């Protein structure tokens, strides 16, 4: 059977420097968690049971809250335990400009083919830096209902 997961960000609007929580249970929107995986709510980690080459993806969805130029960046960082050699290029980063507020949704994707070991723990960190106004961080939020997502697929199992 295929190994696939697509989790949706849980209870996050504000652009904090925090480890995101995810909807993984069946019926939690379009969230899906196949048989070869599990999500540890208390540790905010996706546990991979079988080793192999995984296509890991992140999708960041942001929306303006206000209707004052506000600029900066928002980031989704894949946090692997144990670490995968590539630590640098494992982050989805969106740059925001005063122009960006003209869009109802600012969407950006990240995808990477990664070799994962058995019992691999994966979590996602939310990072942001916004300036330009006293209310800079409040001017952008993680989009609703088109929710920020995180998932993976087993492309080639090891042998």
């Amino acid at each position: 059977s295929p190994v696939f997961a697509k989790l949706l960000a849980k209870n996050q609007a504000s652009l904090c420097n925090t480890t995101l929580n995810w909807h993984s249970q069946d019926g939690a929107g379009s969230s899906y968690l196949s048989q070869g995986l599990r999500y540890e709510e208390d540790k905010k980690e996706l546990v991979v049971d079988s080793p192999g080459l995984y296509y890991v993806f992140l999708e960041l969805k942001l929306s303006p809250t206000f209707t004052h130029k506000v600029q900066g960046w928002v980031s989704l960082v894949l946090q692997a335990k144990p670490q995968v050699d590539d630590f640098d290029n494992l982050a989805l980063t969106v740059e925001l400009f005063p122009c960006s507020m003209e869009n109802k949704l600012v969407d950006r994707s990240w995808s990477q083919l990664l070799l994962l070991k058995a019992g691999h723990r994966l979590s996602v960190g939310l990072r942001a830096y916004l300036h330009g106004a006293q209310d800079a961080y409040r001017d952008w939020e993680l989009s609703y209902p088109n929710t920020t997502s995180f998932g993976l697929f087993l492309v080639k199992p090891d042998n």
Partner: protein
């Protein structure tokens, strides 16, 4: 009396799959106002400029309002606008400057009348 093996026979606060009807309760922080939809909807979160009016439950979404000094814009309060200054009034499309020969002396409240855009 309703006893049939169907997702039509299920209550709000549940999700149900047509192929094998079971009516599972909504996962935490998800809701369903109608019963027997294939999934529950993720709850809206009210933070920053937005504050809660209604909190999320298994049968209803959270509803937002804006923090003091700001008001809602949009059907489901999708954006916040700063409360009007004198020389303006609150309308459908938000804070709008009062017309030719009209003025509003109040800050953030009130409707303007004809007898600067803020005084006389």
């Amino acid at each position: 009396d309703p006893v049939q093996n169907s997702c039509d026979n299920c209550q709000p606060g549940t999700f149900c799959r047509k192929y094998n009807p079971v009516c599972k309760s909504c996962p935490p922080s998800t809701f369903s106002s109608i019963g027997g939809q294939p999934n529950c909807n993720i709850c809206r979160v009210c933070a920053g400029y937005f504050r809660f009016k209604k909190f999320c439950s298994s049968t209803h979404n959270a509803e937002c309002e804006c923090i003091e000094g700001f008001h809602c814009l949009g059907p489901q309060c999708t954006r916040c606008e700063k409360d009007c200054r004198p020389g303006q009034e609150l309308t459908k499309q938000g804070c709008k400057t009062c017309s030719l020969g009209t003025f509003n002396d109040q800050n953030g409240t009130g409707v303007c009348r004809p007898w600067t855009t803020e005084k006389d």
